[PDB]
Amino acid sequence: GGCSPHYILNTRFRKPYNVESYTPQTQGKYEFILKEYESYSDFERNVTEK
Amino acid sequence: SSHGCKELENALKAASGTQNNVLRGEPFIRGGGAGFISGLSYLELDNPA
């Protein structure tokens, strides 16, 4: 039977008998992580004898 | 006549550089259409608002 009104936006849906709820609980979570590392090492040595 | 030289040079040029650059962020949203949720929660690094 059913035929209770269920809507999402302007569209209307027939809920199956088995379903207690299907509901547009709408959420969004975003995560950005960026890790840049640099190291450099330089060693010049000179030795001169005359 | 006699002559004698001893001559020496020693040079050390050490150097180093480092850089740490770290960026983080987390938009979060509840409510609104899932397309607008995704379109806004995506972090534009030039405008985090």
Short mmCIF file of all heavy atoms in Angstrom, two decimals, chain A residues 2-43:
data_model
loop_
_atom_site.label_atom_id
_atom_site.label_comp_id
_atom_site.label_asym_id
_atom_site.label_seq_id
_atom_site.Cartn_x
_atom_site.Cartn_y
_atom_site.Cartn_z
N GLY A 2 1.35 1.66 1.15
CA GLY A 2 2.17 2.87 1.19
C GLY A 2 1.39 4.08 0.72
O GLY A 2 0.30 4.37 1.21
N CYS A 3 1.98 4.79 -0.23
CA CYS A 3 1.38 5.99 -0.82
C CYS A 3 1.25 7.13 0.19
O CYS A 3 0.39 8.00 0.06
CB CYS A 3 0.01 5.67 -1.43
SG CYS A 3 -0.47 6.75 -2.78
N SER A 4 2.10 7.13 1.22
CA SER A 4 2.40 8.36 1.94
C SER A 4 3.28 9.28 1.09
O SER A 4 4.14 8.79 0.34
CB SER A 4 3.09 8.05 3.26
OG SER A 4 3.46 9.24 3.93
N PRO A 5 3.09 10.59 1.18
CA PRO A 5 3.97 11.52 0.44
C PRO A 5 5.36 11.56 1.06
O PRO A 5 5.52 11.88 2.24
CB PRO A 5 3.25 12.87 0.57
CG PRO A 5 2.51 12.76 1.84
CD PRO A 5 2.07 11.32 1.94
N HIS A 6 6.37 11.26 0.25
CA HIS A 6 7.77 11.49 0.59
C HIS A 6 8.41 12.30 -0.52
O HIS A 6 8.23 11.98 -1.69
CB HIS A 6 8.52 10.17 0.76
CG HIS A 6 7.94 9.26 1.80
ND1 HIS A 6 8.28 9.34 3.13
CD2 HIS A 6 7.06 8.24 1.69
CE1 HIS A 6 7.62 8.42 3.80
NE2 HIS A 6 6.88 7.73 2.95
N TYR A 7 9.14 13.35 -0.16
CA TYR A 7 9.77 14.22 -1.15
C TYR A 7 11.27 14.32 -0.89
O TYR A 7 11.73 14.25 0.25
CB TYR A 7 9.17 15.62 -1.13
CG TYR A 7 7.87 15.76 -1.87
CD1 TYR A 7 6.68 15.35 -1.30
CD2 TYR A 7 7.83 16.32 -3.13
CE1 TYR A 7 5.48 15.48 -1.98
CE2 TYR A 7 6.65 16.46 -3.82
CZ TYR A 7 5.48 16.04 -3.24
OH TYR A 7 4.30 16.18 -3.92
N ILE A 8 12.02 14.49 -1.97
CA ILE A 8 13.35 15.08 -1.95
C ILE A 8 13.41 16.13 -3.04
O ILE A 8 13.11 15.84 -4.20
CB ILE A 8 14.46 14.02 -2.12
CG1 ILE A 8 14.45 13.04 -0.95
CG2 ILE A 8 15.83 14.69 -2.22
CD1 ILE A 8 15.45 11.93 -1.06
N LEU A 9 13.78 17.35 -2.67
CA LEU A 9 13.62 18.52 -3.53
C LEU A 9 12.19 18.52 -4.05
O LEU A 9 11.25 18.36 -3.25
CB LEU A 9 14.71 18.50 -4.60
CG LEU A 9 16.14 18.34 -4.09
CD1 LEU A 9 17.12 18.29 -5.24
CD2 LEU A 9 16.49 19.46 -3.13
N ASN A 10 11.96 18.70 -5.35
CA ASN A 10 10.62 18.64 -5.92
C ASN A 10 10.17 17.25 -6.34
O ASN A 10 9.02 17.09 -6.75
CB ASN A 10 10.55 19.58 -7.13
CG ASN A 10 9.59 20.74 -6.92
OD1 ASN A 10 8.63 20.64 -6.15
ND2 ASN A 10 9.85 21.86 -7.59
N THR A 11 11.03 16.23 -6.26
CA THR A 11 10.65 14.89 -6.68
C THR A 11 10.00 14.14 -5.52
O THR A 11 10.43 14.24 -4.38
CB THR A 11 11.87 14.12 -7.18
OG1 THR A 11 12.40 14.77 -8.34
CG2 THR A 11 11.49 12.69 -7.55
N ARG A 12 8.94 13.39 -5.83
CA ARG A 12 8.27 12.55 -4.84
C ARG A 12 8.54 11.07 -5.08
O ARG A 12 8.56 10.61 -6.22
CB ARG A 12 6.76 12.84 -4.84
CG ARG A 12 6.00 12.33 -6.04
CD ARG A 12 4.77 13.19 -6.29
NE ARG A 12 4.03 13.48 -5.07
CZ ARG A 12 3.28 12.60 -4.41
NH1 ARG A 12 3.08 11.38 -4.88
NH2 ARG A 12 2.69 12.97 -3.28
N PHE A 13 8.74 10.35 -3.98
CA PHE A 13 9.25 8.99 -3.96
C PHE A 13 8.25 8.06 -3.28
O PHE A 13 7.57 8.46 -2.34
CB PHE A 13 10.60 8.91 -3.25
CG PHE A 13 11.69 9.67 -3.94
CD1 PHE A 13 11.82 11.04 -3.76
CD2 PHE A 13 12.59 9.02 -4.76
CE1 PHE A 13 12.82 11.74 -4.39
CE2 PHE A 13 13.58 9.72 -5.41
CZ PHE A 13 13.69 11.08 -5.23
N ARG A 14 8.17 6.82 -3.76
CA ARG A 14 7.45 5.77 -3.05
C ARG A 14 8.43 5.00 -2.18
O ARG A 14 9.29 4.27 -2.70
CB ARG A 14 6.74 4.83 -4.03
CG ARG A 14 5.68 3.97 -3.38
CD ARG A 14 4.32 4.63 -3.37
NE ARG A 14 3.43 4.07 -4.38
CZ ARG A 14 2.87 2.87 -4.30
NH1 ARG A 14 3.06 2.09 -3.25
NH2 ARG A 14 2.10 2.44 -5.29
N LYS A 15 8.31 5.15 -0.87
CA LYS A 15 9.15 4.40 0.05
C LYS A 15 8.79 2.92 0.02
O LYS A 15 7.61 2.58 0.18
CB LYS A 15 9.00 4.95 1.46
CG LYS A 15 9.95 4.34 2.47
CD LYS A 15 9.72 4.87 3.87
CE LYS A 15 8.38 4.44 4.44
NZ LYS A 15 8.26 2.96 4.52
N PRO A 16 9.75 2.02 -0.19
CA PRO A 16 9.45 0.59 -0.04
C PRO A 16 8.93 0.27 1.35
O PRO A 16 9.21 0.97 2.33
CB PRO A 16 10.80 -0.08 -0.30
CG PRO A 16 11.55 0.88 -1.12
CD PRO A 16 11.13 2.23 -0.63
N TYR A 17 8.16 -0.82 1.44
CA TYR A 17 7.66 -1.27 2.73
C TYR A 17 8.79 -1.63 3.68
O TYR A 17 8.73 -1.33 4.88
CB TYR A 17 6.72 -2.46 2.55
CG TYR A 17 6.46 -3.24 3.82
CD1 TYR A 17 5.51 -2.81 4.73
CD2 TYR A 17 7.20 -4.37 4.12
CE1 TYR A 17 5.29 -3.52 5.90
CE2 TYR A 17 6.99 -5.07 5.29
CZ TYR A 17 6.03 -4.65 6.17
OH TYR A 17 5.81 -5.35 7.33
N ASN A 18 9.83 -2.28 3.17
CA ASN A 18 10.95 -2.70 4.00
C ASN A 18 11.74 -1.53 4.60
O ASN A 18 12.44 -1.73 5.59
CB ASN A 18 11.90 -3.56 3.18
CG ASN A 18 11.42 -4.98 3.05
OD1 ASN A 18 10.99 -5.59 4.02
ND2 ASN A 18 11.52 -5.53 1.85
N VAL A 19 11.64 -0.34 4.03
CA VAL A 19 12.49 0.77 4.43
C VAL A 19 11.78 1.59 5.50
O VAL A 19 10.64 2.03 5.30
CB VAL A 19 12.85 1.64 3.22
CG1 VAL A 19 13.67 2.85 3.64
CG2 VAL A 19 13.61 0.83 2.20
N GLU A 20 12.46 1.82 6.63
CA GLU A 20 11.91 2.70 7.65
C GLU A 20 12.17 4.16 7.31
O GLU A 20 11.26 5.00 7.41
CB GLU A 20 12.52 2.36 9.01
CG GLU A 20 12.03 3.23 10.15
CD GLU A 20 12.43 2.69 11.50
OE1 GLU A 20 13.33 1.83 11.56
OE2 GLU A 20 11.84 3.13 12.52
N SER A 21 13.39 4.49 6.91
CA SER A 21 13.73 5.82 6.43
C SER A 21 14.73 5.68 5.29
O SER A 21 15.65 4.87 5.35
CB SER A 21 14.32 6.69 7.53
OG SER A 21 13.44 6.79 8.63
N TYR A 22 14.54 6.50 4.26
CA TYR A 22 15.63 6.95 3.39
C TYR A 22 15.51 8.46 3.30
O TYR A 22 14.57 8.97 2.69
CB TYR A 22 15.53 6.29 2.02
CG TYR A 22 16.56 6.71 1.01
CD1 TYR A 22 17.58 5.85 0.64
CD2 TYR A 22 16.51 7.95 0.40
CE1 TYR A 22 18.54 6.23 -0.26
CE2 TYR A 22 17.46 8.34 -0.51
CZ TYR A 22 18.47 7.47 -0.85
OH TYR A 22 19.37 7.81 -1.82
N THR A 23 16.47 9.18 3.88
CA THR A 23 16.30 10.59 4.14
C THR A 23 17.55 11.36 3.75
O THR A 23 18.67 10.91 4.04
CB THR A 23 15.97 10.83 5.62
OG1 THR A 23 15.75 12.23 5.85
CG2 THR A 23 17.08 10.33 6.53
N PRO A 24 17.40 12.51 3.08
CA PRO A 24 18.57 13.22 2.53
C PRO A 24 19.33 14.02 3.58
O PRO A 24 19.46 15.23 3.51
CB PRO A 24 17.92 14.12 1.47
CG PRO A 24 16.61 14.46 2.05
CD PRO A 24 16.15 13.17 2.68
N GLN A 25 19.83 13.31 4.59
CA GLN A 25 20.75 13.91 5.56
C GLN A 25 22.08 14.19 4.88
O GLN A 25 22.89 13.29 4.66
CB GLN A 25 20.93 12.99 6.76
CG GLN A 25 19.72 13.00 7.69
CD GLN A 25 19.89 12.12 8.91
OE1 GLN A 25 18.99 11.37 9.29
NE2 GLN A 25 21.06 12.22 9.54
N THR A 26 22.32 15.45 4.54
CA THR A 26 23.35 15.88 3.61
C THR A 26 24.47 16.61 4.34
O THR A 26 24.22 17.58 5.07
CB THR A 26 22.76 16.78 2.52
OG1 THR A 26 23.76 17.05 1.53
CG2 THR A 26 22.20 18.09 3.09
N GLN A 27 25.70 16.15 4.14
CA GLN A 27 26.85 16.60 4.90
C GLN A 27 28.10 16.43 4.05
O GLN A 27 28.15 15.57 3.17
CB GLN A 27 26.99 15.79 6.20
CG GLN A 27 28.33 15.86 6.86
CD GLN A 27 28.36 15.07 8.15
OE1 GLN A 27 27.34 14.95 8.83
NE2 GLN A 27 29.52 14.53 8.49
N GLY A 28 29.10 17.27 4.27
CA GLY A 28 30.37 17.05 3.61
C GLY A 28 31.58 17.48 4.42
O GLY A 28 31.57 18.54 5.05
N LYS A 29 32.61 16.65 4.42
CA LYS A 29 33.82 16.88 5.18
C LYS A 29 35.03 16.76 4.26
O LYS A 29 35.16 15.76 3.54
CB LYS A 29 33.84 15.93 6.39
CG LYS A 29 35.16 15.58 7.03
CD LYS A 29 34.97 14.50 8.12
CE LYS A 29 34.00 13.37 7.76
NZ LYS A 29 33.81 12.40 8.88
N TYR A 30 35.90 17.76 4.27
CA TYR A 30 37.10 17.80 3.45
C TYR A 30 38.35 17.92 4.31
O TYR A 30 38.34 18.56 5.36
CB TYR A 30 37.04 18.98 2.47
CG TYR A 30 38.08 18.96 1.37
CD1 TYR A 30 38.00 18.05 0.33
CD2 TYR A 30 39.13 19.85 1.38
CE1 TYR A 30 38.94 18.03 -0.68
CE2 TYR A 30 40.09 19.84 0.38
CZ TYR A 30 39.99 18.93 -0.64
OH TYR A 30 40.93 18.92 -1.64
N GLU A 31 39.42 17.28 3.85
CA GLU A 31 40.70 17.26 4.54
C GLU A 31 41.80 17.44 3.51
O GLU A 31 41.87 16.70 2.54
CB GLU A 31 40.90 15.94 5.30
CG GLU A 31 42.28 15.76 5.89
CD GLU A 31 42.44 14.42 6.59
OE1 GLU A 31 42.39 13.38 5.91
OE2 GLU A 31 42.62 14.41 7.83
N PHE A 32 42.66 18.44 3.74
CA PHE A 32 43.85 18.67 2.93
C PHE A 32 45.05 18.77 3.86
O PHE A 32 45.03 19.56 4.81
CB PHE A 32 43.70 19.94 2.10
CG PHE A 32 44.80 20.15 1.10
CD1 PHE A 32 44.62 19.80 -0.22
CD2 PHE A 32 46.00 20.70 1.49
CE1 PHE A 32 45.63 19.99 -1.14
CE2 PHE A 32 47.01 20.90 0.57
CZ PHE A 32 46.82 20.55 -0.74
N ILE A 33 46.09 17.98 3.60
CA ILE A 33 47.36 18.10 4.31
C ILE A 33 48.50 18.05 3.31
O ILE A 33 48.52 17.17 2.43
CB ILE A 33 47.51 17.02 5.40
CG1 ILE A 33 47.88 15.67 4.79
CG2 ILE A 33 46.23 16.91 6.20
CD1 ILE A 33 47.85 14.52 5.78
N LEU A 34 49.43 18.99 3.43
CA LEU A 34 50.58 19.09 2.54
C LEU A 34 51.82 19.36 3.38
O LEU A 34 51.84 20.31 4.17
CB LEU A 34 50.37 20.21 1.51
CG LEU A 34 51.57 20.66 0.69
CD1 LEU A 34 52.11 19.51 -0.14
CD2 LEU A 34 51.17 21.82 -0.21
N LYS A 35 52.84 18.53 3.22
CA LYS A 35 54.09 18.63 3.97
C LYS A 35 55.25 18.57 2.98
O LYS A 35 55.53 17.51 2.41
CB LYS A 35 54.20 17.51 5.00
CG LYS A 35 53.04 17.46 5.98
CD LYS A 35 53.24 16.39 7.03
CE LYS A 35 52.06 16.32 7.99
NZ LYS A 35 52.23 15.26 9.02
N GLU A 36 55.90 19.71 2.77
CA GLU A 36 57.09 19.80 1.93
C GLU A 36 58.32 20.03 2.80
O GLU A 36 58.34 20.94 3.64
CB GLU A 36 56.96 20.95 0.93
CG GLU A 36 55.68 20.92 0.13
CD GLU A 36 55.63 22.02 -0.91
OE1 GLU A 36 56.70 22.54 -1.28
OE2 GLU A 36 54.52 22.37 -1.36
N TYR A 37 59.35 19.20 2.60
CA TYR A 37 60.60 19.31 3.34
C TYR A 37 61.75 19.41 2.35
O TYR A 37 61.79 18.69 1.35
CB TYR A 37 60.83 18.11 4.26
CG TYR A 37 59.71 17.86 5.24
CD1 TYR A 37 59.23 16.57 5.46
CD2 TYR A 37 59.16 18.89 5.98
CE1 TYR A 37 58.21 16.34 6.37
CE2 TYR A 37 58.13 18.67 6.87
CZ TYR A 37 57.67 17.39 7.07
OH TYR A 37 56.67 17.16 7.99
N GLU A 38 62.68 20.32 2.61
CA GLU A 38 63.94 20.36 1.88
C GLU A 38 65.10 20.47 2.86
O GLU A 38 65.02 21.19 3.86
CB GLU A 38 63.99 21.54 0.90
CG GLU A 38 62.90 21.52 -0.14
CD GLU A 38 63.10 22.60 -1.19
OE1 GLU A 38 64.27 22.90 -1.52
OE2 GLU A 38 62.09 23.15 -1.68
N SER A 39 66.18 19.75 2.56
CA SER A 39 67.48 20.02 3.17
C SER A 39 68.55 19.88 2.11
O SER A 39 68.43 19.08 1.19
CB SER A 39 67.76 19.06 4.34
OG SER A 39 67.80 17.72 3.90
N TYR A 40 69.59 20.70 2.21
CA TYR A 40 70.79 20.48 1.41
C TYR A 40 72.02 20.87 2.21
O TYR A 40 71.98 21.77 3.05
CB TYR A 40 70.72 21.22 0.07
CG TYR A 40 70.94 22.70 0.12
CD1 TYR A 40 72.22 23.24 0.12
CD2 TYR A 40 69.87 23.58 0.13
CE1 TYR A 40 72.42 24.60 0.15
CE2 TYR A 40 70.06 24.94 0.16
CZ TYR A 40 71.33 25.45 0.17
OH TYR A 40 71.52 26.81 0.20
N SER A 41 73.12 20.17 1.93
CA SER A 41 74.38 20.34 2.62
C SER A 41 75.51 20.45 1.60
O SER A 41 75.52 19.72 0.61
CB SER A 41 74.65 19.18 3.58
OG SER A 41 74.99 18.00 2.88
N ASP A 42 76.44 21.36 1.86
CA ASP A 42 77.54 21.65 0.96
C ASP A 42 78.81 21.78 1.78
O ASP A 42 78.80 22.44 2.83
CB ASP A 42 77.27 22.94 0.16
CG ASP A 42 78.36 23.24 -0.85
OD1 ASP A 42 79.33 22.45 -0.93
OD2 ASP A 42 78.25 24.25 -1.56
N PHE A 43 79.89 21.15 1.32
CA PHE A 43 81.16 21.16 2.04
C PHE A 43 82.25 21.22 0.98
O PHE A 43 82.49 20.24 0.27
CB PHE A 43 81.27 19.91 2.92
CG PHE A 43 82.63 19.64 3.50
CD1 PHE A 43 83.63 20.61 3.50
CD2 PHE A 43 82.91 18.41 4.05
CE1 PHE A 43 84.87 20.33 4.04
CE2 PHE A 43 84.15 18.13 4.59
CZ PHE A 43 85.13 19.10 4.59
#
